[PDB]
Amino acid sequence: GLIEVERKFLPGPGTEERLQELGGTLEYRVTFRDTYYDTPELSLMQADHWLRRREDSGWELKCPGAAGVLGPHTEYKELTAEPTIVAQLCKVLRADGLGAGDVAAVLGPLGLQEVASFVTKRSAWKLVLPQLRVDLDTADFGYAVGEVEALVHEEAEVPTALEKIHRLSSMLGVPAQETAPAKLIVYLQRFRPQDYQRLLEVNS
């Protein structure tokens, strides 16, 4: 139950320089491979849940922290304990008690399948005020996207995190009303358009 509060944006030529000028430091660069999973009907995505396997690492379910109330794609609790990931997968897909301690065992009984696997290179920036993060991601299919991010522990901490993230974003030059899609979504646009389209359709 670590809570990610986030705002994606398309980085510009001056993004990194502005981050430096604000006292930000580049903490690490990292390449990782992620495989995303869903049912044929895309039940998780439609529920704004995001299941992936970080290759060589472990599983993660992103669970929306304020569905309905907040605008979408703003707040996620990141589940990494597999017994909890399973419990929650069964909850959203409406399967019963499976008796499952692990996701791999749960994949077939729940009708979950691989929908994407791709490599990302990340530059991870921190701002040391108690801290904000700015990840700059370039996926292996050419899409560059950024994310201003706060990690909190309490849902009570979320309104403040939002304000902080909104304010950092302005200072980086991101128009109040700009949005940018997740890497996964540009992946579907490019390689599985029929899935991208069904997601825009059913979301109307």
UniProtKB/Swiss-Prot annotation:
Changing E78A: Mildly decreases enzyme activity. GO terms for molecular function: hydrolase activity; magnesium ion binding; thiamine triphosphate phosphatase activity. Residues 2-191 form the CYTH domain. Keywords: Acetylation, Cytoplasm, Hydrolase, Magnesium, Metal-binding. It catalyses: thiamine triphosphate + H2O = thiamine diphosphate + phosphate + H(+). This is Thiamine-triphosphatase. Monomer. Widely expressed but at a low level. One of its GO terms (biological process) is dephosphorylation. Signal peptide: none annotated. One of its GO terms (cellular component) is cytosol. Belongs to the ThTPase family. Its cofactor is Mg(2+). It is an enzyme of class 3 (hydrolase). Transmembrane segments: none annotated. PROSITE patterns: CYTH (PS51707). Its EC number is 3.6.1.28. Mg(2+) binds at E4, E6, D135, E147, E149. Changing D34A: Strongly decreases affinity for thiamine triphosphate and enzyme activity. It is found in: Cytoplasm.
